Amino acid sequence: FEDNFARFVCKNNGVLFENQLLQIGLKSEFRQNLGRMFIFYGNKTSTQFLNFTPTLICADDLQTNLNLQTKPVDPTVDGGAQVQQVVNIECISDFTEAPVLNIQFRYGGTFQNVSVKLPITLNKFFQPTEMASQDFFQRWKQLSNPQQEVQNIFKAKHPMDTEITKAKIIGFGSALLEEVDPNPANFVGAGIIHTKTTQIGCLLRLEPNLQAQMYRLTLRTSKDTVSQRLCELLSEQF
């Protein structure tokens, strides 16, 4: 099997899970604190699936932070057919955990049971905000409380590739701000995390070291837990 949850930080669409029997494809869209996720259950076999009952599971804290609404789907999935489920998503507040999609079905007399995390991460509610450099620096200096900054220094997992790095920052949900850092090698981003009761301004600086293949990533936001979660999600992409 293939489980691709961790490959959805900076993209919205693709195969989430695939094994010999079943493909779970996914498309998703987000705006402000809301999203919609289309789940596509593909029957790769010649036998229908039966009592197919997808269950969304949200761990302890997560249910108060993240609201998911869906309809019942086909109990029966004909062989070679593809069936759609739509999930409506609302971010009530920031969160770390991901919802779990659990899939149980009968198949030719055999009991099938699959679980995979849905790619609903905090940065799906992250929208880009362009701004001039003096505005950026006023905002950065406004976030001067030590709790607001989370910094990570880490070895690159991927090539030190400028154009790919730019696309990652953009696919993450940040604006990419040019000519703000007077070092043209560095990357600066800005956006807003949308929740039900607040917008959280988020600023970031990514500093490559080409010769050492290292990065320093810094994220400043008005909420410690947002700075932390955004930094750990974004650090993992480079």
Binding site: N13, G14, Q23, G25, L26, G42
Partner: peptide
């Protein structure tokens, strides 16, 4: 009749 919203674990 047959075809899917197509996704792929390989190519591309």
């Amino acid at each position: 009749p047959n075809n899917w919203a197509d996704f792929s674990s390989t190519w591309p």
